């Protein structure tokens, strides 16, 4: 599914993302926007290490989820990557929280660094009632 902006902000807020690890809801929204376009079915294949990025937060199959076809798989989230291609985003939200647990935090996502880091992100939560 493709979430509408405010629909997603309210869902992310209900799932405890706002201020999670010092990360504002607006920053999480910006990440989702540039990673997938708020799309739970987004996928991206990386020919270099043969990994795939999955779902709304584009979680990678090498370190975080198991897709069963990626070399050097760690499965740090202990989740099948297919669980991150679902309309219900609880698993995706939890795995995104696991990514930011690491020292790098939300800087792990290159797109967040190129589009959201040091960017006014007020528009992502404006008028959503969050």
């Amino acid at each position: 599914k493709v979430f509408e902006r405010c629909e997603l902000a309210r869902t992310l807020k209900r799932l405890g993302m706002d201020g999670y690890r010092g990360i504002s809801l607006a920053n999480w929204m910006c990440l989702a926007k540039w990673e997938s376009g708020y799309n739970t079915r987004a996928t991206n294949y990386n020919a270099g290490d043969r990994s795939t990025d999955y779902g709304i937060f584009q979680i990678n199959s090498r370190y975080w989820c198991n897709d069963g076809k990626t070399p050097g798989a760690v499965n740090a989230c202990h989740l099948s990557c297919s669980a991150l291609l679902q309309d219900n985003i609880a698993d995706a939200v939890a795995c995104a929280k696991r990514v930011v647990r690491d020292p790098q935090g939300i800087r792990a996502w290159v797109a967040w660094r190129n589009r959201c880091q040091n960017r006014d992100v007020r528009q992502y939560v404006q008028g959503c009632g969050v």
Partner: nanobody
Amino acid sequence: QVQLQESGGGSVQAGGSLRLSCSASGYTYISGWFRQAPGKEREGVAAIRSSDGTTYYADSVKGRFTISQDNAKNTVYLQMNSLKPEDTAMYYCAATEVAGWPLDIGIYDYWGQGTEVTVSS
């Protein structure tokens, strides 16, 4: 964040059953029970992932202990059947918002105060 409160601890005779409860004041993804027997290091017992209801048990209690959830009351339960003297311990409820191996102590961020379970004879 999330505060956890356990209850149901008590003294039971060997072979008996006991059910512990744990309430959470906010949303949790994974919840589990970690016990500390007298003089020993704390160890994992059982865990549950709330999204799909999958459950994970330590080899020492697998088959005997079962963990469940009541999503309406936001509570988790640890049912223990066929208790042994060796199950005597302070049982702690813990939770996290992160996805990881549910019996990995390192992913847990929220901890209760513990509820004592004593198994005699």
